[PDB]
Design a protein around this ligand. Structure first.
Ligand SMILES: *C[C@@](C)(O)[C@](*)(O)[C@H](CCC1CCCCC1)NC(=O)[C@H](Cc1ccc(OC)cc1)NC(=O)[C@H](C)NC(=O)CN1CCOCC1
Ligand SMILES: [Cl-]
Ligand SMILES: [Mg+2]
Ligand SMILES: [Mg+2]
Ligand SMILES: [Mg+2]
Ligand SMILES: [Mg+2]
Lengths: 244, 226, 204, 250, 196, 243, 231, 241
């Protein structure tokens, strides 16, 4: 029958590892680096695009940084198409919570839900897992600014600064060196860009290669603003920090 | 509602009034009852207003996809068959009464459809509360081989009969002309025999006439930003 | 027994010169018993305003539903929904409940942000659209509002004139209905400012 | 008489590759060249009508397909896979958008729905990925003109200009030299015809080339009159004669 | 409605009036109640117009699919498909159908299917609201193996009386002749049949 | 290689090896035949007497479908029974809807499509039988033979099983020597002879002859088993011809 | 070899190995004999124990007042098939007021077994059955194999060493068929038949299991001191 | 090497099961040809009855799908009949739902989309058949549309299918290069059948008797197959000039 052709995507190896999760993580290690840094007065999300072509329409393009609601954003590392399936689910979960409780979804609850979906693909159904790692940047009135990551295993953890995708070992060493707890958003912007500038496989870090975003509680009159940076604005912050 | 359709020399024409009613009060004075199904297939609607609107839009959507799939001009019989099968399925609970007319590669066609899913073929038809007023005119004046000019006159007259003599019907006359080998011409507000007369007085109030408790600005924008 | 007149209330909307106005009363009751005098019936999703009369549980449910839908619209489209499109969304959403409908009388009001054109619309409980140039009425005193609007209204009123006309239309209609009144709110909407005014009215 | 293939046929290999997606992309590489160029006042999509027999009537086989009145599509790879994707794309434009909002979807969102269908064939049980890459050109009121590429993975990217299939590497280099942000639609058509001539071996004319534009509104093609707001489809497929006229000024 | 089908020497003839009513209003005065389910298998429809049309459309579909696979269906087979739909959905249908057809083997055959969904093979059949008024007339005047001209007169005279007495019946008398020769449509106007 | 391990897999030849393996189960089974005559059909089958303990005339192999169709098969006997059970359902639903009993070509395609369906998926096995069947309908007599692939044709004479080549040779003589046709009573006699002649391939164990027939004149177009004196007359004719 | 992984796969010589492996489980099972005359039909079964402390596994199951079987192979599969027979015998009684014909019972078991041989996921039944019965056409004995093949017989045996009992019955055919209106002599012939399949062990009181059905005899099972008479 | 057993991509981007289904197409060793007249569409196919025990009237690869549409199959008969029954069902369902007779090209597209599904879904095998649909369409006129196991389809001025298709194809190509028109300029279908048979005889290099051929003719509002005697009349006319 059909058994013959079943890869068996949801089994343990003799060592107690999930084959398909491990191989999905290997896929993600080749994807463009994404960095999240959390400060006292905001969060930075920086991410490196993978496909440098002069003919790519950058201003209308979005492969890395997605908006989940007004308070929560994600940086993606892995298969973009896989990430979009999950993003639209997370967008729906946030609106289901808002409809039910008349309050914006707490960041951890949204994260746990997505992480539980990913987990399910590793334990049942016989399907391949999602080849995606997220950095969640968000704000709520309980814990304030939060950074999380989830990976194909469905495991998630909280961070002060974190990287996913390519060269994370190198990137995490650099962040661990220069990060401090009393740091501010402007300093974190500079740290994120400097870390990408050193870890990048490219010859030089330019505006046409980056997606950049900030979540600040530095909007008018104590609200939270998500800023997805335009190409010209990424170019300006590259000159300001002194990279180009 | 007064809707009608009749055939002429090398075409078919549809007519409709523009009144919608909720109990005994007028809900709309300028509503479009002649509906687009395909570029050369149109549908007059009567009965439950949402139903006649929704059923024509659904079949119009499916006719468009069918036309794309087959790479052909849609036929009136397709719209007819799809409408009647849908309406039959719902056993009259979708209370839509429709006059379907159009031009296609087979020729010109004119059908009526009732809410329970029965269909009729005819040279002149009328539906709605004003159908009897309209049919009286059509029975008195319809003949074979009408010119376009005579057909528009007769169609508009049949609708007018409904407008004046039926309380269900009123306001303006909408027409759609579908002629062979030509673009269909849709003529909204073809007649306007019921413009409201100028008022005796202006009821514009002196400013400050209304007593106010509070004022505030509403924030409609996204993020007031730093 | 009749779901559309258990709780009571009214909404009216009008167009003016480069502006629209939408207004509502503040009553919520259980038939004869007045319960709340703060039950607003006008909501907004960006710059599109929605008034809803009828059964109060459905008013609240539909507000929450259209907030949900317009939030997802905005995330995907990367722009606020416009009044014309929102009207179609309301109609669709009501008609999908054709045989178990929400017992409501919605009213859309707003200015298209690109064309600058004033826009109002009204619906029956199953989504039939009435797209009026002049005015839209809804609620338990809809007959009364029709009478006021049809005599008081003239086209191309300036914002501060249009305020007076819509306010007098609402107030005098509400005073002839047992199940409407208990306060009233009027929104004056221009292309990039919206003023909200609470009206002084008789509290019986 | 059972569907027992409830498991993924596309899985991660030890190197992190999704084999079936890579092999689908290889099938796209073997396919005939197609391209897309975006101008200021329009977009052009083009491809070669590779006729399998001279007895075959190549007019009946439409490689360039209308999806909505303002959106068109072209492909490289497996033609049958493309045909069913066009059927689903046209339908999803109605069910998930037009029947809700009363208007056609913007280019990016229709693309997103096509992308979603292709991603599901990359993860669902008992199916292989689609063996095509699509180029989708379109216009909508708030985004203006746009050109998107969609791959077997489900991934999509917006382009100023690009090419896919057989001679895409050479074609993309050719487009990089010629493309600027001040191109008129006629200039983009001229560049499309120049680019496509390099990848074509045999005859090069209106009968062996398929070319469509997303441009101005065509009220003449609408079929009816009497609604000022409905101004006509921006999608237009160029005729065999219209192509040959521009080949004289080439 | 006044409908009938009559077998004769050369085959079978179906006959009907042309009146459709919504209460006392004549919604259609030129209705065609003689409807084709196959080349030489026709039916006369009475009851709910929606129901009989819906049934007739389904039968035409079934016989078209029968023909693709097994060749020309018998009149008995057509009557059986009508019966199956009518009987199994008797709680939701108001349909009274007369099925008439011509084979070369069986010649002219007539099957009547009343409200219950029973089948009855008969030499001739009458149905519809106006049939009540002509049972006496048709029984006295019907003979087997009539000529074509005699059978046309028998139907014309019969439906003339049905029309005269039944308000629900009226308009033109349509007929459809089914023989080896082919399919012939006949029409007879008020000024002809009223003076009989 | 590996193309023959799963049903519905095309080999590089364009062959379904599992279907060809089912044919081997058919070739392994006992001989069964069909003879089309003037106004009907005759079916006959070889039943191997494995032991004296088998009750004579009891283990009936030929099966009736509706009242007018006979079915006989060679190969896996249970697979044949499963196919006849389906054939009975198909004939019942046909008669239920269309009133008339199922025509033989119509019935043939019902079995054909069902057998063919068991070559479309790896979750099912092909049928391990070739089925000879037929009867009398409105258009006259029809004899068919249906293979594991779903392939079927109409026949003048048909044969399958271990003795098929021997039988086929004998049937081919009858077709040549009787172009005007064969009578029903003649076809019964000839069927007995052909089974007896085809028994040389299964000559170790003795056997039991079983014949059935549908004929417009001899059975009113109904399927009946040949019994008693008419069976013994056919056995005597067959015994005389071998000696 | 490569073609024995599942029941859905033919071998290159047209064999179903999973069915043949199921057939093998029957040969490993304990011997049971079936035989009949015109008036009565008898089952004799050699029951098997696990050890001296254990009970002897029951071999005979009653299906109706006029029908029952003996088993050899997987006993849980005999339970499933006997339960199906009970239901089919019961359906015939309740709906038609009709005792199920033994021949028709065989046809039903054949078709139930067949479905398991043609579809993926399932397995063949791992048991052989000898069904006896008395119906409107007299005494009957059937042999069921889980391939689907059912056979009506005067006598037979299945299980380990069954060829010894089967040869005896083949010689005795003309004698035991004539044992009409004498149940004890017909059982004697069955007990003498099953004795030809014994080696080392002999028929003891809790070893032997006999069942009989006939003209004015319901299907009854004899075990324990009720079979001491025949030892 | 399980990428050759089910319909998934090989490393080269190929579907081997689709390719092997194309090879099953020629298992019958039968050649078919289709041409268009002014008012008609003619399809001819070789008929081979090897066994004397066969009833030759039942041996056919031409199917009447609907009244207007005919279909000739190149491939094994079980798959041919599978495809035939489905096309008949689809054609009838179309007429019921949309109120007009299913066009030849639309049926072809539908069957091609069904074939495409078998190339994408693993549990369904491709059918090992090439389907040639013929009609006189009421909009497009004389029509030939052909479907294959890949799910590919296209319209044809004329076409040929089978082991010796290339010989037939080049013969037809050369005729249309001379005439410079998309059809056989001939009033009667009888003469278009005579053309079809003549150009098959020239292409294959074999003579035909009445029992060696099988003919299908599409006219306006019907498709029909010719009897052996109708073909004999055709063969006599060819020989007499
Ligand atoms: C008014 C008239 C003359 O009857 C016309 O038939 C008119 C047609 C309007 C329609 C034509 C096609 C384009 C879209 C507009 N119909 C109405 O105005 C309709 C009349 C009506 C009312 C109730 C009814 O119940 C069986 C049948 C017909 N009016 C409405 O549908 C109004 C807008 N809504 C309601 O009355 C409330 N609905 C509550 C749920 O049940 C249905 C009525
Ligand atoms: Cl399809
Ligand atoms: Mg009040
Ligand atoms: Mg009060
Ligand atoms: Mg009268
Ligand atoms: Mg497959």
């Amino acid at each position: 029958g059909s058994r013959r052709y079943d890869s068996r995507t949801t089994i343990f190896s003799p060592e107690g590892r999930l084959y398909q999760v491990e191989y999905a993580l290997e896929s993600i290690s080749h994807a463009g680096t994404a960095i999240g840094i959390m400060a006292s007065d905001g969060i930075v999300l920086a991410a490196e695009r993978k496909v440098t072509s002069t003919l790519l329409e950058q201003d209308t393009s979005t492969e890395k940084l997605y908006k989940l609601n007004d308070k929560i954003a994600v940086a993606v590392a892995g298969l973009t198409a896989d990430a979009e399936i999950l993003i639209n689910t997370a967008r729906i979960h946030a609106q289901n919570y808002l409809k039910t409780y008349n309050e914006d979804i707490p960041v951890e609850i949204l994260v746990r839900r997505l992480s539980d979906i990913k987990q399910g693909y590793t334990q049942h159904g016989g399907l391949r897992p999602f080849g995606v790692s997220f950095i969640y940047a968000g704000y709520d009135d309980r814990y304030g600014y939060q950074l999380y990551t989830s990976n194909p295993s469905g495991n998630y953890t909280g961070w002060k600064a974190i990287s996913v995708g390519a060269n994370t070992s190198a990137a995490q060493t650099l962040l661990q060196m220069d990060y401090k707890d009393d740091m501010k958003v402007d300093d974190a912007i500079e740290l994120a860009l400097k870390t990408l500038s050193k870890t990048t496989d490219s010859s030089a870090l330019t505006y046409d290669r980056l997606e950049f975003a900030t979540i600040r509680k530095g909007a008018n009159d104590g609200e939270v603003y998500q800023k997805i940076f335009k190409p010209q604005e990424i170019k300006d912050i590259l000159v300001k920090t002194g990279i180009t | 509602t007064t809707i009608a359709g009749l055939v002429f020399q090398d075409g078919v024409i549809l007519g409709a009034d523009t009144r919608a009613t909720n109990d005994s009060v007028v809900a709309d004075k300028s509503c479009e009852k002649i509906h687009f199904i395909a570029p050369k297939i149109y549908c007059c609607g009567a009965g439950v207003a949402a139903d006649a609107e929704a059923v024509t839009q659904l079949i119009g959507s499916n006719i468009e996809l069918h036309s794309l799939y087959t790479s052909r001009e849609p036929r009136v019989v397709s719209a007819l068959q799809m409408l009647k099968q849908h309406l039959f399925k719902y056993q009259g609970h979708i209370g839509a009464y429709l006059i379907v007319a159009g031009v296609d590669p087979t020729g010109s066609h004119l059908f009526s459809i009732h809410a329970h899913g029965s269909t009729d073929v005819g040279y002149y038809l009328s539906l709605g509360s004003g159908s009897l007023a309209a049919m009286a005119v059509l029975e008195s004046h319809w003949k074979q081989d009408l010119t376009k000019e005579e057909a528009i006159k007769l169609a508009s007259d049949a609708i007018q009969a409904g407008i004046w003599n039926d309380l269900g019907s009123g306001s303006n006359v909408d027409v759609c002309v579908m002629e062979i080998g030509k673009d269909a011409e849709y003529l909204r507000n073809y007649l306007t025999p019921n413009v409201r007369e100028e008022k005796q007085k202006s009821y514009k109030f002196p400013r400050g006439t209304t007593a106010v408790l509070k004022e505030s600005i509403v924030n409609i924008c996204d993020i007031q930003e730093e | 027994s009749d779901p559309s007149s258990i709780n009571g209330g009214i909404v009216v909307a009008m167009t003016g010169k480069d502006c629209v106005a939408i207004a509502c009363d503040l009553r919520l009751g259980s038939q004869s018993l007045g319960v709340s005098n703060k039950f607003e019936k006008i909501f907004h999703y960006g710059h599109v305003f929605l008034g809803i009369t009828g059964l109060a549980t459905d008013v609240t449910t539909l507000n929450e539903m259209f907030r949900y839908k317009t939030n997802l619209y905005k995330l995907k489209e990367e722009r606020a929904i416009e009044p014309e499109t929102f009207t179609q969304l309301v109609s669709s959403s009501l008609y999908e409940r054709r045989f178990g409908p929400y017992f409501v009388g919605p009213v859309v009001a707003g200015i298209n942000s690109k064309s600058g054109k004033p826009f109002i619309a009204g619906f029956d409980l199953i989504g039939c659209i009435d797209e009026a140039k002049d005015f839209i009425v809804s609620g338990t005193a809809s007959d009364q509002l029709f009478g006021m609007c049809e005599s008081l209204y003239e086209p191309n009123l300036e914002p501060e004139d249009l305020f007076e006309t819509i306010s007098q239309a609402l107030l005098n209609a509400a005073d002839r209905d047992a199940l409407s009144g208990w306060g009233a709110v009027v929104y004056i909407i221009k292309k990039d400012e919206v003023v909200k005014r609470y009206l002084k009215m008789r509290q019986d | 008489m059972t569907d027992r293939y409830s498991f993924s046929l596309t899985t991660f290999s030890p190197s992190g590759k999704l084999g079936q997606i890579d092999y689908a992309l290889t099938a796209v590489k073997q396919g005939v060249t197609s391209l897309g160029i975006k101008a200021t006042n329009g977009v052009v999509i083009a491809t070669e009508k590779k006729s399998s027999s001279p007895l075959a009537m190549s007019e009946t086989l439409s490689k360039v397909s209308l999806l909505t009145p303002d959106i068109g599509a072209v492909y490289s790879g497996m033609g049958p896979d493309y045909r069913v994707l066009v059927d689903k794309s046209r339908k999803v434009a109605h069910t998930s958008y037009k029947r809700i909002y009363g208007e056609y979807p913007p280019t990016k969102l229709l693309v997103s729905e096509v992308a979603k269908i292709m991603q599901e064939a990359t993860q669902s049980g008992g199916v292989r990925p689609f063996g095509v890459s699509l180029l989708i050109a379109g216009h909508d009121e708030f985004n203006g003109f746009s050109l998107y590429q969609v791959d077997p993975s489900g991934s999509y990217f917006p382009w100023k200009a690009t090419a896919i299939g057989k001679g895409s590497v050479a074609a993309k280099t050719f487009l990089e030299k010629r493309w600027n942000d001040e191109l008129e639609l006629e200039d983009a058509i001229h560049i499309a015809l120049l680019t496509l001539k390099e990848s074509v071996e045999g005859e090069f004319n209106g009968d062996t080339i398929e070319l469509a534009i997303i441009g101005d509104e065509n009220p003449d093609l609408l079929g009816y009159t009497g609604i000022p707001t409905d101004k006509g489809p921006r999608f237009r497929k160029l005729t065999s004669q219209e192509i040959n006229d521009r080949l004289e000024a080439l | 409605t006044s409908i009938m089908a009559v077998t004769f020497k050369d085959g079978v003839i179906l006959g009907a009036d042309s009146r459709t009513t919504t209460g006392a209003y004549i919604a259609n005065r030129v209705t065609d109640k003689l409807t084709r389910v196959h080349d030489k298998i026709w039916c006369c429809r009475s009851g709910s117009a929606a129901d009989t049309q819906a049934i007739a459309d389904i039968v035409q579909y079934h016989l078209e699919l029968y023909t693709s696979q097994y060749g020309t269906p018998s009149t008995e087979t057509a009557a059986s498909v009508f019966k199956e739909l009518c009987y199994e959905n008797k709680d939701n249908l108001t349909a009274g159908i007369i099925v008439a057809g011509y084979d070369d083997k069986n010649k002219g055959e007539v099957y009547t299917i009343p409200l219950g969904g029973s089948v009855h093979k008969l030499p001739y059949a009458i149905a519809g609201s106006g049939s009540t008024f002509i049972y006496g007339y048709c029984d006295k005047n019907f003979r087997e193996n009539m000529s074509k001209e005699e059978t046309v007169d028998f139907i014309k005279h019969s439906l003339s009386q049905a029309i005269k007495w039944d308000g629900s019946s009226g308009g033109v008398i349509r007929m459809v002749v089914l023989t080896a020769a082919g399919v012939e449509r006949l029409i007879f106007y008020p000024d002809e049949y009223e003076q009989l | 290689t590996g193309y023959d391990l799963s049903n519905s897999v095309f080999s590089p030849d364009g062959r379904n090896f599992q279907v060809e393996y089912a044919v081997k189960a058919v070739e392994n089974g006992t001989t069964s035949i069909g003879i089309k005559c003037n106004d009907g059909v005759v079916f006959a089958v070889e039943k191997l007497i494995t032991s004296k303990l088998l009750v004579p005339q009891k283990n009936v192999k030929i099966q009736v479908v509706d009242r007018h169709i006979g079915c006989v098969y060679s190969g896996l006997i249970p697979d044949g029974r499963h196919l006849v059970n389906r054939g009975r359902e198909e004939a019942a639903s046909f008669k239920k809807l269309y009133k008339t009993p199922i025509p033989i070509p119509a019935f043939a395609d019902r079995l054909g499509q069902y057998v063919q369906a068991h070559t479309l998926y790896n979750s099912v096995r092909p049928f391990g039988v070739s089925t000879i069947f037929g009867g009398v309908d409105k258009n006259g007599a029809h004899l068919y033979m249906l293979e594991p692939s779903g392939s079927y044709w109409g026949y003048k004479g048909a044969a399958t099983g271990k003795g098929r080549q021997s039988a086929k040779a004998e049937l081919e003589k009858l077709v040549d020597h009787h172009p005007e046709g064969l009578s029903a009573r003649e076809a019964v006699k000839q069927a007995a002879k052909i089974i007896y002649l085809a028994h040389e391939d299964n000559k170790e164990k003795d056997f039991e002859l079983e014949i059935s027939w549908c004929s417009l004149s001899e059975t009113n177009g109904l399927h009946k088993f040949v019994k008693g004196d008419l069976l013994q007359e056919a056995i005597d004719f067959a015994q005389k011809e071998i000696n | 070899n490569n073609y024995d992984g599942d029941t859905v796969t033919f071998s290159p010589t047209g064999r179903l190995f999973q069915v043949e492996y199921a057939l093998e489980a029957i040969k490993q099972g304990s011997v049971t004999v079936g035989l009949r005359s015109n008036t009565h039909a008898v089952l004799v079964a050699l029951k098997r124990n696990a050890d001296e402390l254990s009970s002897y596994q029951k071999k005979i199951i009653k299906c109706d007042e006029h029908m029952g079987l003996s088993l050899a192979g997987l006993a849980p599969d005999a339970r499933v098939l006997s339960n199906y027979l009970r239901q089919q015998c019961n359906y015939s009684s309740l709906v038609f007021n009709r005792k199920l014909a033994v021949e028709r019972a065989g046809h039903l078991l054949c078709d139930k077994a067949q479905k398991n041989t043609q579809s993926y996921g399932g397995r063949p039944y791992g048991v052989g059955l000898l069904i006896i019965g008395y119906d409107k056409s007299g005494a009957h004995l059937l042999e069921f194999q889980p391939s689907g093949n059912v056979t009506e017989l005067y006598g037979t045996a299945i299980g380990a060493r069954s060829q010894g009992a089967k040869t005896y019955l083949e010689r005795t055919l003309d004698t035991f068929i004539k044992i009409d209106g004498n149940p004890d002599e017909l059982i004697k012939a069955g007990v003498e038949a099953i004795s030809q399949s014994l080696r080392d062990e002999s028929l003891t009181v809790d070893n032997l299991s006999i069942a009989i059905v006939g003209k004015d005899t319901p299907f009854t099972i004899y075990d324990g001191e009720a079979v001491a008479k025949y030892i | 090497g399980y990428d050759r057993h089910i319909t998934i991509f090989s490393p080269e981007g190929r579907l081997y099961q689709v390719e092997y289904a194309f090879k099953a197409t020629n298992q019958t060793n039968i050649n078919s040809l289709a041409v268009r007249g002014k008012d008609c569409t003619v399809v001819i196919s070789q008929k081979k009855v090897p066994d004397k025990l066969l009833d030759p009237t039942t041996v056919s690869y031409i199917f009447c799908i609907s009244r207007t549409i005919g279909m000739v199959v190149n491939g094994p008969i079980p798959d041919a009949r599978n495809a035939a029954l489905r096309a008949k069902a689809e054609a009838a369902e179309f007429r019921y739902k949309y109120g007009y007779d299913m066009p030849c090209d639309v049926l072809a597209k539908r069957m091609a989309n069904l074939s495409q599904i078998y190339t994408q879904r693993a549990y369904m095998r491709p059918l090992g058949v090439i389907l040639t649909f013929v009609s006189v369409d009421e909009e497009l006129g004389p029509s030939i549309y052909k479907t294959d196991p890949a799910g590919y389809y296209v319209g044809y001025k004329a076409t040929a299918t089978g082991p010796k298709q290339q010989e037939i194809t080049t013969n037809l190509e050369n005729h249309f290069k001379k005439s410079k028109i998309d059809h056989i300029n001939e009033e009667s279908w009888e003469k278009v059948v005579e053309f079809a048979i003549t150009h098959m005889i020239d292409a294959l290099g074999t003579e035909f008797s009445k029992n060696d051929l099988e003919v299908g003719v599409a006219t306006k509002d019907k498709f029909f197959t010719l009897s052996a005697e109708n073909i004999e009349e055709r063969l006599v006319a060819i020989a007499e000039q």
